[PDB]
């Protein structure tokens, strides 16, 4: 396995990871404000991979400071993981490619 | 098994504090979030507060004076709430839930009759 | 706050008949009722979670339905050990609120 398959992977399990902290500070933030809903586990839970996915129906966010420092991880881990996949293929597609064309 | 086990009864004269105690058994995790709910004789549940064991948050019924002071012990699994300064309108049955952190009261305790008198 | 109105707040009902409880709550909070029994010099006990969703070691008489900002609980044939007064919760927005209590007779 090379580099960029290592970091794909990597990013893989520290997004999953990210995903099951986020909901459980997310829903620790939230509980206390009134008219949070962002407040019991499992929709947190499907709150934070729509929040990593970008998707963001919007039937659910965080109204706190910690809330919303929370969700900013999230994205940003969303964002980076998949990006790296992308960069990952890229690779991949320009190694083949190089052989491809015999150099 | 009980899961939730309190005190039957604790006496108080007015002005004074009492600690109302709460030990939790069965299956615990980290998600759990042990609330407390004020019932007067004749009158319906009053929710008081929330705490969570494993990280020691506490939150509090903003709709109605704060009386109460939440904390917990990790090592005997044992929730208590501080009620302080208490008067006659403090007198009620105590619960204590249990919540799996989805929402609904799965198991309560049996019940502390707080009352205040001299 | 969400604010749960439980009306009536005593149901009168013959032995055998089907009866049912209302709880209608403030604003729209999809299905995050849930509905409690507690008879005389007793605990709350959780009878139906989620709205409808039925629990483990409750009688299969008790339902519940409604979505939104009606809810309702059912008893099928009302017999006298369903004698308590009946209480429901939300938890879709904190804090979490109980309504009113309805007291059932027979």
């Known amino acids: 396995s090379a580099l960029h398959w290592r970091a794909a992977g990597a990013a893989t399990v520290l997004l999953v990871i990210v995903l099951l902290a986020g909901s459980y500070l997310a829903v620790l933030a939230e509980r206390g404000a009134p008219g949070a809903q962002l407040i019991t586990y499992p929709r947190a839970l499907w709150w934070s991979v729509e929040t990593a996915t970008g998707v963001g129906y919007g039937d659910l966010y965080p109204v706190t400071l910690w809330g919303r420092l929370v969700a900013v991880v999230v994205m940003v881990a969303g964002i980076t993981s998949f990006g790296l996949v992308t960069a990952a293929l890229a690779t991949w597609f320009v190694g083949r490619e190089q052989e491809r064309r015999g150099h | 098994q009980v899961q939730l086990q309190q005190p039957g009864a604790e006496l108080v004269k007015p002005g004074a504090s009492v600690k109302l105690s709460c030990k939790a058994s069965?299956?615990?995790?980290?998600?759990?979030?042990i609330h407390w709910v004020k019932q007067r004789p004749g009158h319906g549940l009053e929710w008081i507060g929330e705490?969570?064991?494993?990280?020691?948050?506490?939150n509090y019924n903003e709709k109605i004076q704060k009386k109460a002071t939440l904390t917990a012990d990790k090592s005997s699994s044992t929730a208590f709430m501080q009620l302080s300064s208490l008067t006659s309108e403090d007198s009620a049955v105590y619960y204590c839930?249990?919540?799996?952190?989805?929402?609904?009261?799965?198991?309560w305790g049996a019940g502390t009759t707080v009352t205040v008198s001299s | 706050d969400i604010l749960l109105t439980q009306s009536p707040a005593i149901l009168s009902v013959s032995p055998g008949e089907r009866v049912s409880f209302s709880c209608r709550a403030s604003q729209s909070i999809g299905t995050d009722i849930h509905w409690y029994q507690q008879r005389t010099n007793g605990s709350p006990r959780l009878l139906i979670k989620y709205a409808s969703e039925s629990i483990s070691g409750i009688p299969s008489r008790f339902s519940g339905s409604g979505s939104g900002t009606d809810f309702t609980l059912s008893i099928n044939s009302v017999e006298s050990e369903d004698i308590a007064n009946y209480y429901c919760?939300?938890?879709?927005?904190?804090?979490?609120?109980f309504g009113s209590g309805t007291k059932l007779e027979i």
């Open positions: 919760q939300q938890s879709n927005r904190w804090p979490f609120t």
């Open positions: 839930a249990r919540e799996r952190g989805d929402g609904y009261f799965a198991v």
């Open positions: 705490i969570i064991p494993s990280y020691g948050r506490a």
């Open positions: 069965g299956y615990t995790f980290t998600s759990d979030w």
